[PDB]
């Protein structure tokens, strides 16, 4: 039945709406993974809609487009798998399979490197400390002071590693502060 | 019947995937409108899925959940309308109806104030200039230099107007640069 498939899609839409209204600004790592888990399954459920329209077609024009669009999503899904596994070879990090970007941000906080997805990987990376909590490029990494800021962070993408040097860190309003991460060398493979 | 709705959702996900993959990093203002246009219509189509399941009430357990779940997405859609029209009263700008946040960021660039949605509105706002192009909080605003950075930006939300002050601008690698906006006063409405 399509009625039960209608309810599944309604919960898929409802899940994101909750993630878009109540958990958008929130950057909890478990919550962020759940958002990435949802965005990953957005590719099979895009393919499932077109496969259902391809098999249970209305007209050959409608079914023919759904066959082409299922290949279009299928090609875009394999392009994610190709780019992520190529990224996974360089980094050996489980964040390489995030479905939003193929670039990783490595911040050495609390000793262990805190790898996070990075969207743009620009020349300058912004580090903001708020109430003693560091957030770099919209990733709430955790507790970190101005004096405890990582003196060097790296950004890893496919066939290129970008090392970033801490620039000028300015402390504002006590616990809060700001920092500058200008790229200084490129570790291209 | 009920198969054409499958094709509509398939293109809704296909548009979602393209915006989330191909044009995720791209910050063209017309494209950013399209992303906000798509996220706005995600509320009627979440309600449309649950109304369709509520109308097709073959079993009371599935239909009864869909009736209650359509109320949950129905109420939080009107919660968006209530929150945005309150924001529209204070700001009188068409960006108040963005479906991602109820907080607006006003950056005075090129004379006319550039108003953009702001997800966080924290104490410190980072302004990254890359290749002579300013991007504040992930919103690419346009051509700007370190010497041409706005000395004061404001962040307008409901019942609060937070004025931000240019802390210190650092120039890196020539055209690029970096500066921070620390809040210095609040215009409590």
């Amino acid at each position, epitope marked *: 039945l399509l009625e039960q498939w209608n309810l599944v899609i309604g919960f898929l839409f409802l899940t994101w709406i909750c993630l878009l209204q109540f958990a958008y600004a929130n950057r909890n790592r478990f919550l962020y993974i759940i958002k990435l888990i949802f965005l990953w399954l957005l590719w099979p459920v895009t393919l499932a809609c077109f496969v259902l329209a391809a098999v249970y077609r209305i007209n050959w024009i409608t079914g023919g487009i759904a066959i082409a669009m299922a290949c279009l999503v299928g090609l875009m899904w394999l392009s994610y798998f190709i780019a992520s596994f190529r990224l996974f070879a360089r980094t*050996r990090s489980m964040w390489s399979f995030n479905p939003e970007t193929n670039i990783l941000l490595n911040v*050495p906080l*609390h*000793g*262990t*490197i805190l790898t996070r997805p990075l969207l743009e990987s620009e*020349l300058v990376i912004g580090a903001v400390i708020l109430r003693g909590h560091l957030r770099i490029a919209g990733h709430h990494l955790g507790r970190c002071d101005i004096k405890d800021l*990582p*003196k*060097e962070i*790296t950004v890893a993408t496919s066939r290129t590693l970008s*090392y970033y*040097k*801490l*620039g*000028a860190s300015q402390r504002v309003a006590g616990d809060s502060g700001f920092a500058a991460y*200008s*790229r*200084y*060398r*490129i*570790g*291209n*493979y | 019947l009920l198969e054409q709705w499958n094709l509509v959702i398939g293109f809704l996900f296909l548009t979602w995937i393209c915006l989330l993959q191909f044009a995720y990093a791209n910050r063209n203002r017309f494209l950013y409108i399209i992303k906000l246009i798509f996220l706005w219509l995600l509320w009627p189509v979440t309600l449309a899925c649950f109304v369709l399941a509520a109308v097709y009430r073959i079993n009371w357990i599935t239909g009864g959940i869909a009736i209650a779940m359509a109320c949950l997405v129905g109420l939080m859609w009107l919660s968006y309308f209530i929150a945005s029209f309150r924001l529209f009263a204070r700001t009188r700008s068409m960006w108040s109806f963005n479906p991602e946040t109820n907080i607006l960021l006003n950056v005075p660039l090129h004379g006319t104030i550039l108003t953009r949605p702001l997800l966080e509105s924290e104490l410190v706002i980072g302004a990254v200039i890359l*290749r002579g192009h300013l991007r504040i909080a992930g919103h690419h605003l346009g051509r700007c230099d370190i010497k041409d950075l706005p000395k004061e930006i404001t962040v307008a939300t409901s019942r609060t107007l937070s004025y931000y002050k240019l802390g210190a601008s650092q*120039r*890196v*690698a*020539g055209d*690029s640069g970096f500066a921070a906006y620390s809040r210095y006063r609040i215009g409590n409405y």
Partner: antibody
Amino acid sequence: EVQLQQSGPELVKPGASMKISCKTSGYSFTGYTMNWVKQSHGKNLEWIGLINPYNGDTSYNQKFKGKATLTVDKSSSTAYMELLSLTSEDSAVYYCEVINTYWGQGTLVTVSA
Amino acid sequence: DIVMTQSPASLAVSLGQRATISCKASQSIDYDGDNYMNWYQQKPGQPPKLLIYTTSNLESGIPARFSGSGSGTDFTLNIHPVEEGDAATYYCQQNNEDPYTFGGGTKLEIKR
């Protein structure tokens, strides 16, 4: 702040391997990549390679592949460079830096019999 | 492999003047429209001290008299005003492609 302490000078017979310890302090050892730079004849700065002490992947110079092997010791926060088959061309001062800003004092390696 | 050539081999300027140090890369190091040039200072008996990274950005704690210019292949280190403690050797390193080759280095001499 960030201090990198290296081993002292050692007179090494030709053809004998030598491991150069670069003890680090003032920061989380695994945090930042550890570069190695050779300064031959007191002027010719040459880049040997870098090792990421968190995971252990290295990136050598083409000339120093098979000559130097970079290793780390997370327990003692000490990064090692093990030079292989030392010759008279290896009589140099070897530095270990972090972000090119904080450097070790240099290990003057004298390869003579 | 990128070859860095520094001119002059030795530089001799007096105090308070401007010292111009060149560094001509064999190949263009423009990555994403930006050059990653590192300028070091090495007094005798001491490890090199990073002055300028990414061709213009001055290192923290370095006095604001070392300026890096140029893009593409020509790169310039300018010291103004020159003080007594600037008598050292200045190296340029391309931080773009493996290996990060250093320059030949020039021994700055104070004219007294």
